[PDB]
Paper text:
The T4BS secretion coupling complex of L. pneumophila comprises the inner membrane AAA+ ATPase DotL (IcmO) and two inner membrane/cytoplasmic components, DotM (IcmP) and DotN (IcmJ). In this study, we determine the crystal structure of the cytoplasmic domain of DotM and observe large patches of basic residues, leading us to hypothesize that DotM might form the recruiting platform for Glu-rich motif-containing effectors. Our results suggest that DotM’s cytoplasmic domain is capable of binding directly another subgroup of Legionella effectors that contain acidic Glu-rich motifs at their C terminus.
Further binding studies were conducted with several DotM mutants, where Arg residues (single or double) on the protein’s surface were mutated to Glu. Five mutants were produced: R196E/R197E (termed “M1”), R314E/R315E (termed “M2”), R347E/R348E (termed “M3”), R217E (termed “M4”), and R262E (termed “M5”). Binding was abrogated in M1, M2, and M4, indicating that these Arg patches are involved in binding of acidic Glu-rich peptides. M3 and M5 were unaffected suggesting that they are not involved in Glu-rich sequence binding. The Lpg1663 and the consensus OSM peptide was also assessed for binding to the M1 and M2 mutants and binding was found to be also abrogated. To ascertain that the observed binding deficiency in M1, M2, and M4 variant proteins was not due to folding defects caused by the mutations, these three proteins were crystallized and their structures were determined and shown to be virtually identical to the wild-type protein. Thus, the mutations do not introduce structural defects, suggesting that the ITC binding results reflect an effective role of the residues in binding. Other interactions are between residues R196 and R197 of DotM and CegC3 E145 and a stacking interaction between these two residues and the side chain of CegC3 F146. Remarkably (given that acidic Glu-rich motif-containing effectors represent only a subset of Legionella effectors), the M1 and M4 mutations resulted in a significant decrease in L. pneumophila replication in the macrophages (up to 70–80%). However, in A. castellanii, M1 reduces intracellular growth by up to 90% (after 24 h) while the slight reduction in intracellular growth of the M4 mutant is not statistically significant. We observed that the M1 and M4 dotM mutants producing the reporter fusions Cya-CegC3Cter, Cya-OSSCter, or Cya-Lpg1663Cter displayed lower levels of effector translocation compared to the wild-type strain of L. pneumophila (Cya-CegC3Cter: 50% and 30% decrease compared to wild-type DotM for M1 and M4, respectively; Cya-OSSCter: 50% and 40% decrease compared to wild-type DotM for M1 and M4, respectively; Cya-Lpg1663Cter: 60% and 55% decrease compared to wild-type DotM for M1 and M4, respectively).
Author numbering:
A (entry chain A): 159 to 179, 185 to 380
B (entry chain B): 156 to 379
Amino acid sequence: WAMALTPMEFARKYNLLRKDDPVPGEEMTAGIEEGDAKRVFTMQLGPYWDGFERCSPQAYALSAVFMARMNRDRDAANNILKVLDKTFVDGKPDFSVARPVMKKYQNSELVQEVVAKHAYVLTVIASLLEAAREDGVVPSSEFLWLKPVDRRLWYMLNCVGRQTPYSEVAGPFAHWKAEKEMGRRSLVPMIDEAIRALEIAVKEVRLTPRQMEELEP
Amino acid sequence: KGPWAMALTPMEFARKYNLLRKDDALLDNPVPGEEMTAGIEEGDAKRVFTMQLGPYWDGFERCSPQAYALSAVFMARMNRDRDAANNILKVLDKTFVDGKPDFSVARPVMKKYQNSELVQEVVAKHAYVLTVIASLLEAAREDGVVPSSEFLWLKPVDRRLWYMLNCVGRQTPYSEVAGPFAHWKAEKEMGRRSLVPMIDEAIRALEIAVKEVRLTPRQMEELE
């Protein structure tokens, strides 16, 4: 199973660590290259929302599920989930099953309110899931097949309801939270909370002498 | 092709394990409706399907952790304990989000039901882990739907078990579990467990599936 990177693993994967320095108790600790971190987190944000037709198939179909739930149509929702489970078992899932439900609910009032308030596919669909959860539980485990289909989406949706995201979606999570705080959609990335949380998490972790000697300035 | 590759079709299976050969009955006496098809090397096929049977059942403690935990879920259902079952499935689901799974969660349930009458009856009648657990799933389904959906998490941990369990309730199995499927059915038809592999039906079925597929001339010449 393909585990989420820790903060330190993430920093190391994207070459974000830096010789910081001398804060007593911070011996054998690294800093973060903020500019590079900004770029990584900006890339994580993914595409602008620009009509559901342009979402990936998986983002489209799960959006449809959540919209159906927002509109109290559990049957339409469970039918997608069921076909996707069955057809995913059978070897490649039928994301077209969601199209009728998209057509019915994409301009419904509650959906239009979510789309109006978020600029990115990932922040739109997070708020669709948050909103669907006023109807019922809607766990990650209704859509287990998404992990191998779309890792970034899987992690974003598993962070809805959580206070701290996985580092691999900390950018879109920070942005989503910033959009809610601003009370409008934002095209300008608002990912500064991801940078500060990475720095904090990375400074908790001691490096080996070998690791410290690798730190570039 | 990754931990999530699609199931091999019969023809792909026969090619991966080098089971295709020239059909010497059709070479020496051709039939007009049957040109351009291959036969199966039956010796090698018996080996491959026997290799799919997996280990003998020899107490649940010796099963793979996934086989242990799913047996426990099915056991609970056979004994009408949906909550103990669902508790395992919940906890397993939780751990696959980001981590590695808590198969430990199944231990209390296995303790409680492994010597229950209905479990004892399944274990008595099947000799292999795969055939026991197939029958436990089949029995668990008298209590409710127990779809494979709910353990999609299995496919990356144990390909063979996942396909085996998705064939319970099917008439034709995937080629990659045709051996233990054939065995399982043979046990049910004999009315006892069988340690001797009973996989001949998987060989017959492969030959029949392979005869449906026309090869190209180039493919026909490359046969041995």
